[PDB]
Design a protein around this nucleic acid. Structure first.
Lengths: 71, 414, 71, 414
DNA sequence: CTATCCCCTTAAGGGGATAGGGA
DNA sequence: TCCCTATCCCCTTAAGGGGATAG
């Protein structure tokens, strides 16, 4: 897939995946266990965002991550 | 001598017992790079050096039986150099729980990869009754239990590094074998993921035969594979001396957070809570850390493994001293005053109190309680109507009775 | 590659890459602009770890990440 | 009418100018799914709906020249409906900076994918001299500049959506074409990543010809491709009116944090700081947000582009009013008392002060200054010995003089 | 449907002390 | 008897979630 190198191109990519799936910030927030506010913070200000948060939301998107070389 | 650790005929690394009595492990470089690469145990994350922490000892320890008597039982049989974990595993190393195959360094001695002796009805009656008063296996758990391989229509004994397909349990509780065989049929009927168990009858003896979920025939049907796994004490690298929360073991919060890392996190998280209700319904109090396992998957991934080792603490009331008010869950729920655990004092508000702190989807706690509310009755019927003609109607009666008693507490709200 | 689903299985995998590359917590900490202590915390306590941190370390390992479906 | 945004013959989306005069952009679903899928600008992250933020206006705005008298020159030439970004771009939309090709939504048009008119020495002398008193192009920057296509041995003019290979600059500073042809030759000699520029001479006019790094021939040499890019105003979705830090524009910190997100983060970061010293040494004060660019790579990746638009503020001292003590860097450095920015007041200690807060590897800051310390002299030579026989020896002299003057500050330490 | 907003109580990365860790 | 790294001290700052609601 496409290599991500920052919190912002990250949040962007995931927010994309949410929209292209018809999910709202609310339903994902319920499934996992965080408030709708957090998802919104993550999407617009991912810099100061926790790792558990990020994985929580990763899970709610039926997604996963993997490392690789930057070439 | 070091124990070479194998996993389905793959060289993982080596257990080494130092002069100081020091247990240590080093992954084999060829394993760190393998396709199938994964840590033996989550408490032992892939890395390069010699691992020296307590997790190494505790992990391997949690492969042998709980009771140190069972242990002497083993230092006798296969003449062990000690009751030490290393020394015992150097005898019954082959078919251990999970997937690990510990074979001494001085011992390629490769095991017939696929070999078995088709047992007779008397040989069986002998092995079954035996565990009361080539078979290099190891079963970890609360009670006395062996394991066998079912092929075709005969119960055979594995020979070599030949895996087993059934965990067979002997009657200890007066009818443990019957209690659990009920609990399982029930848990399946209610959608919970448990293994198909059958009852085997050998002359006089009566044993339970549980299908292993940590075993699977390869595609060709030519090789029996062991699936790597570990329980909640191994995962947190704790000694089996703390499997119960009341002793320092992991509880709901602990397990739940962890599950968040599962491959099937949201599903696992649900099932787990759900199982916290089930155990409450059938008054099961054996819900300790060593009774929950995760499968270990390529890369280090894990998902919750089916539920196992289910027994109901109901057929043990009244005529003895035990009473419903003395039944306490292994893992506590969030209460008004601290944490409540007494089955007969537990109510739906408690499960919802718990979900509340754990931040488990309140709506899903509502759906779980609700599903149980309207299924229990139908379940009990279908299970009862399955119980073989020779099934102790008191076990049925005792369980089926209190379940409804508790179930009432549900229907009255859902 | 391998799908990661938590902060812990993440830090483990990255720590591995570091060892099998002969890098120390100090040298990576210098290149990026972070404390050696932080690399340590991330490696042992990745749950409460910031996303910029994680990407900073991601870069110093000449790595990158990618989303994918959990199947 | 909407403008359909093209990028190397791939439909990215559409620019819409609403009644109320509200610019809006919506990515084509097909592009949101494409192999080549990437935002038009990092200030405009791929998503589904209509993008309405000021980032949409400012981005497209930043494709046109800054002096909006030059905008009237365009509203005059290609009769524009306004000096509005949308109305102008609907005329010269074809060859814009970066890789965007704005063609009216009406505007499909199969415009010659690859067509060009081999100019004469006199047509060239016409075009060059022209910008002082099919050619649908757009150059963004601080001074008056057009662009051409060099093929074979001739300077040709593009036809249709045909791309250009060189950004040509006309003499505004009396010899801006000579000043920058030096600094470029210098910057290459010192290893800084810059584009190869040449000086073209047409009769009387003298013009600069910079090879474009946002343009590249396909493998087959059958199509010239536009490499998507954008400057530091667009990246942060700022208006060109704030390109300078002293007006609100991004500075070192801002740029350095951003670069942390680069494909080549550590390398860029270095290259960037390094340039900040280079700029100091050759007294360049044109180091504004619009002079640094990132390439945009499939998926949203970006990496620093070579440096460009380099001029030295030295050949403008003394005889006029300007003095060395009046030269200030576009981007300030960290000082004892706030932030210093006066070139002749700047010292290595200021670069190391900066590197200190930004948490840029102190050692690497040491290596940069070092490397300059023992390179400058040799560089000046190799460059000076390249200046064509007709090069204004005051430009050389002036720059080469002050560079050493400042260079001393370095060699006395490194 | 997001996004701040008042309030929080377990505390990021990090300032650069700092002390066993292992080979 | 030594590099490596799991910790460990004190101040600026404060994840975010916790929960009311504001474009």
């Amino acid at each position: 897939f496409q290599k991500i190198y920052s919190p912002t191109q990250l949040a962007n990519a995931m927010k994309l995946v949410r929209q292209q799936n018809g999910w709202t910030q609310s339903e994902l927030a319920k499934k996992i266990g965080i408030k709708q506010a957090t998802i919104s913070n993550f999407e617009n200000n991912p810099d100061n965002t926790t790792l558990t948060t990020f994985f929580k939301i990763l899970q709610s998107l039926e997604l996963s991550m993997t490392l690789c070389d930057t070439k | 001598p070091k124990l070479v650790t194998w996993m389905n005929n793959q060289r993982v690394g080596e257990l080494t017992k130092l002069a100081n009595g020091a247990h240590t492990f080093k992954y084999a470089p060829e394993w760190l790079a393998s396709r199938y690469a994964r840590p033996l145990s989550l408490s032992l994350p892939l890395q390069r050096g010699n691992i020296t922490s307590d997790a190494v000892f505790n992990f391997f320890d949690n492969l042998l039986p709980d009771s140190p008597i069972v242990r002497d039982r083993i230092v006798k049989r296969y003449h062990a150099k000690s009751r030490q974990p290393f020394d015992l595993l150097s005898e019954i190393g082959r078919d251990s729980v999970g997937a690990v195959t510990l074979i001494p360094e001085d011992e390629t001695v490769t095991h017939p990869i696929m070999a078995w002796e088709k047992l007779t009805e008397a040989r069986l009656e002998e092995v079954l009754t035996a565990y009361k008063a080539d078979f290099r296996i190891s079963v970890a758990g609360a009670q006395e239990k062996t394991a066998l391989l079912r092929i075709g229509n005969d119960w055979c004994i594995p020979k070599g590094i030949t895996p087993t397909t059934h965990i067979i349990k002997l009657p200890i509780l007066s009818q443990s074998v019957d209690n659990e065989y009920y609990c399982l049929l029930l848990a399946k009927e209610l959608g919970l993921n448990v293994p198909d168990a059958e009852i085997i009858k050998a002359g006089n003896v009566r044993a339970l035969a549980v299908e292993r979920f940590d075993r699977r025939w390869n595609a060709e049907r030519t090789v029996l594979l062991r699936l790597p796994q570990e329980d909640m004490c191994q995962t947190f690298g704790l000694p089996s001396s703390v499997k119960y929360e009341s002793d320092g073991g992991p509880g709901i919060a602990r397990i739940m957070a962890f599950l968040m890392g599962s491959s099937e996190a949201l599903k696992d998280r649900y099932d787990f809570m759900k199982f916290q209700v089930f155990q409450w319904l059938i008054g099961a109090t054996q819900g300790h850390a060593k009774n929950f396992s995760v499968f270990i998957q390529a890369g280090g991934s894990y998902r919750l493994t089916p539920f196992y080792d289910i027994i109901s603490a109901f057929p043990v009331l009244g005529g003895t001293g035990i009473h419903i008010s003395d039944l306490k869950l292994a893992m506590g729920l969030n209460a008004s005053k601290g944490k409540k655990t007494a089955i007969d004092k537990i109510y739906p508000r408690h499960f919802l109190a718990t979900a509340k702190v754990l931040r488990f989807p309140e709506v899903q706690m509502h759906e779980i309680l609700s599903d149980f509310a309207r299924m229990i009755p139908a379940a009990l019927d279908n299970v009862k109507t399955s119980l073989p003609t020779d099934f102790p109607e008191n076990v049925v009666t005792a369980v089926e009775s209190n379940v409804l008693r508790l179930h009432g507490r549900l229907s009255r709200e859902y």
